[PDB]
Design a protein around this ligand. Structure first.
Ligand code: HEC
Length: 251
């Protein structure tokens, strides 16, 4: 979730340009962002973001069942740019934005906005109302070309803040050997227990939560780290970058 980034990373963008969501949302799926090529000072403009995905394909939910995907994003604007206050957003634009609550990455970073989780079936396309700064009022800003960075995600992550895998990723064999047993991890709650007999004779048990499907069978020999399941992840994270020129009024 965006909050996972907010709580563990002061800067959502790394030196090489990678956005932190990518540290847990391991699959890449393209996104798009569009803004006017230029904007006048103290003016409200729109950033249109696209987080496309196949709305017919379901994901594994935290409860182990299948369900719809949700989306979220982080938008890094130049210092001086901020979410446009409601009083400055035209009714026509509020209509396009919809029932969304854009929040600052932190109270001290009003130029970085996040949103989500929100339903992907409704928000695979989102509109963000932005208020441009004013050089004649702000010294830290000039009339030049500024970059805008965007990270958009759809679907649950593969790893949690504590480093533990979610039920929405691939599970692998902890050791090499022959699968001597595969049984339910519980009397309905999904999941499996895969017993692997090592060469020395020791039998290790790999626990797999409900969600992923097995691609192995009893009697089958497996090697260390070999996938025991499919990759249930049908979502993905993507990044895009654009630019906008703060235009001088000039007259
Ligand atoms: C690892 C510490 C994570 C970081 C950094 C980010 N996300 Fe994440 N996200 C992660 C997990 C393990 C989960 C699943 C939670 C669960 O239900 O078990 C999520 C989930 C989301 C969601 C919801 C998706 C859905 O329900 O279909 C969204 C929209 C999402 N995450 C967005 C998101 C963004 C935009 C991030 C960067 C700003 C981000 N996440 C970072 C793990 C982690």
């Amino acid at each position: 979730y965006p909050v996972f980034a907010q709580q563990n990373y002061a800067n959502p963008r790394e030196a090489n340009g990678r956005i932190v969501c990518a540290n847990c949302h391991l699959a890449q799926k393209a996104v798009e962002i569009e803004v006017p090529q230029a904007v006048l000072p103290d003016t409200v403009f729109e950033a249109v973001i696209e987080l496309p995905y196949d709305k017919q394909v379901k994901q594994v939910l935290a409860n182990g069942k299948k369900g719809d995907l949700n989306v979220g994003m982080v938008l890094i604007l130049p210092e001086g740019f901020e979410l446009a206050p409601p009083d400055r957003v035209p009714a026509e634009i509020k209509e396009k934005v919809g029932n969304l609550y854009y929040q600052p990455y932190s109270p001290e970073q009003k130029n970085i906005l996040v949103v989500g989780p929100v339903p992907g079936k409704k928000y695979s396309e989102m509109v963000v109302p932005i208020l441009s700064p004013d050089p004649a009022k702000n010294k830290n800003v000039s009339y030049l070309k500024y970059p805008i960075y965007f990270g958009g995600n759809r679907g649950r992550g593969q790893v949690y803040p504590d480093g533990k895998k979610s039920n929405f990723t691939i599970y692998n064999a902890s050791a090499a050997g022959k699968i001597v047993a595969i049984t339910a991890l519980s009397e309905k709650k999904g999941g499996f227990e895969v017993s692997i007999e090592k060469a020395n004779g020791e039998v290790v048990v790999d626990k797999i939560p409900a969600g992923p499907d097995l691609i192995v069978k009893e009697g089958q020999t497996v090697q260390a780290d070999q996938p025991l399941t499919n990759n249930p992840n049908v979502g993905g994270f993507g990044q895009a970058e654009t630019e906008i020129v703060l235009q001088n009024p000039a007259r």
